[PDB]
Structures are given as C-alpha cells and as structure tokens.
Structure 1
Amino acid sequence: RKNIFTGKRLNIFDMMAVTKEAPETDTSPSLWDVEFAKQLATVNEQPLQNGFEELIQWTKEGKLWEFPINNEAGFDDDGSEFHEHIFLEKHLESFPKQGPIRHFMELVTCGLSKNPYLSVKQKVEHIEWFRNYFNEKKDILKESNIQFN
C-alpha cells in the first residue's frame, strides 16, 4: 500500500548539492572503458528490421554516399584558397625580378594557375624544381649574360 520509491533510504549519500560540473574528459580512455562502451553498443545491437535501417547503418559507417550528392564530398585540397592556387607570383621571389628567366617562370606560373588538377603543394614543387635546376645551371646562364639571383 506504499510506493516503493518513497520510504526509508540507505541515508549514506545525501542529495548532492551540485553534480559534477568539472568533468575529467581530458583523461585517456582505458581498455575497461572501451569494453564498457562496446557492451553499451551491444545492448542496442539488433538485426535490421527493414531496408531503411540497412541504408541508415551504411550511411553511418560511411559505406554509402551522403545525399544530396556532392562530387567534392570528403575531399578538400588541404583547405587551400583560390589565391593560393592562382596567384603564384609570390613563389617567384627566388628568381630575377626582370629577365628572360622571369618571363619563362611567368609563363610557367600562368600555366600552373590555369591548372585545376594539381594541388598547391605540387604547383609549388614545380617552381621549386625550376629554381633548383636554374641554380645548378647558373654557370651556363651567366655565360649567356643572364643573371640568376
């Protein structure tokens, strides 16, 4: 005739004034916690009731594409920006300010800027290789009276 939730208690722990508002989530996870989480997942583990649940699980696992379809989904070119791809003149600072070498590297940088198939790293690598090659060939260039740096 009495509610079970109301009555004499253990009276060991008083009603906590404030719950834990300063969690220790910064701690590293333990194998015990990993297995506890695995069991928490297992208690919900059930066979798929219908095809919609299968699609939901596949989307969660990443096996199935998200919709609406984004052809660039799951791909960012290292978070680059348009100015990094196009304005590559800043990478020509190791080249003569004026001269035939500057003209050729201007052509090369224009071609690279027009190129949408190369990441910024590869575009920079091309210019770096050109710089290294010209440095190794500075003798011939200076014979032709064209200074390189």
Structure 2
Amino acid sequence: SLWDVEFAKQLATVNEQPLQNGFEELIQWTKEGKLWEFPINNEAGFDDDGSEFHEHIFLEKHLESFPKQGPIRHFMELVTCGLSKNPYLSVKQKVEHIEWFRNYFNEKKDILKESNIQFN
C-alpha cells in the first residue's frame, strides 16, 4: 500500500548516508543502471525476443502460401536466403518482407495469369 511504500522510504532514509568514497558512488551508479556492468559484454540489454538460430535462418516455413514450384518460388528462395544471411534484421521484419511479397503477388495475380503463373 501507499503507507507501506512510504514506510519503506523512511527505512531507506534512516539507512541512507551521503556518499563516502568513489567506490560507493560507482556502486550506486551500477545499482541505478547509470554505469555499465563490467566485464563488458557488448550485448547486455539486447535480446531479439529470445529467438534462436533456426528461427532467424530457416524462413522456408513462411513460404507455405507461396507456390513450391515456378519462378515465384525461385525468387522467394533468393529473398529468404538474403534474409537468412542478413545479421542486422530481426525475425519480425524478416517475416514482414515475406508478407509484403505475398501481398504484392496476390494483387498482381492477374499479371501472373497472363504470364501463365499461378500464385496461391
């Protein structure tokens, strides 16, 4: 409750003293998150939704709507291979590119029918 929170603040106040040395200031900064947590990891605080290597790389599971044969399949194989090799993109946006291609091909199915190609 609010009273309990204020009671905890009072307990913190009576246990609080001004900083006595540089080490204490560094400890306070580390606890507050202002200072980094040595040793340096270069990836602390960055998690790509907990995704794994198979989710990042193997994107063929997202081509179920796409036909498995034809020039469209060949083009999507190139796109998925490029997305898999891309290290600067997350799984969400990699799927978004595939979704855009699926929507674009769905809109342009009539042109594909003219070129003797069937999509979905």
TM-score, reference length from structure 1 = 0.79
Hey, what's the Cα distance between the residues in 2 that align with 1:38 and 1:131?
56
Hey, what's the Cα distance between the residues in 2 that align with 1:121 and 1:87?
13
Greater Cα radius of gyration, structure 1 or 2: 1
Hey, what's the Cα distance between the residues in 1 that align with 2:104 and 2:113?
14
User: How far did residue 43 of structure 1 move?
Assistant: 1.2
SS at match of 2:17: coil
Structure 2 unaligned regions, length at least 5: none
SS at match of 1:118: coil
Q: For the aligned residues, what is the CA RMSD?
A: 0.6
Structure 1 residue runs of 4+, over 2 Å off?
none
Aligned length: 120
Output one character per residue of 1:93-132: Cα deviation in whole Å (capped at 9) or x when no partner.
0100111000000000000000010110000000001100
Hey, what's the Cα distance between the residues in 1 that align with 2:44 and 2:72?
40
Hey, what's the Cα distance between the residues in 2 that align with 1:104 and 1:40?
65
Structure 1 unaligned regions, length at least 5: 1-29
TM-score, reference length from structure 2 = 0.98
Which structure: greater helix fraction? 2
Q: Which structure is higher in RCO with an 8 Å CA cutoff and minimum separation 6?
A: 2
**2:66 is the counterpart of 1:78:** no
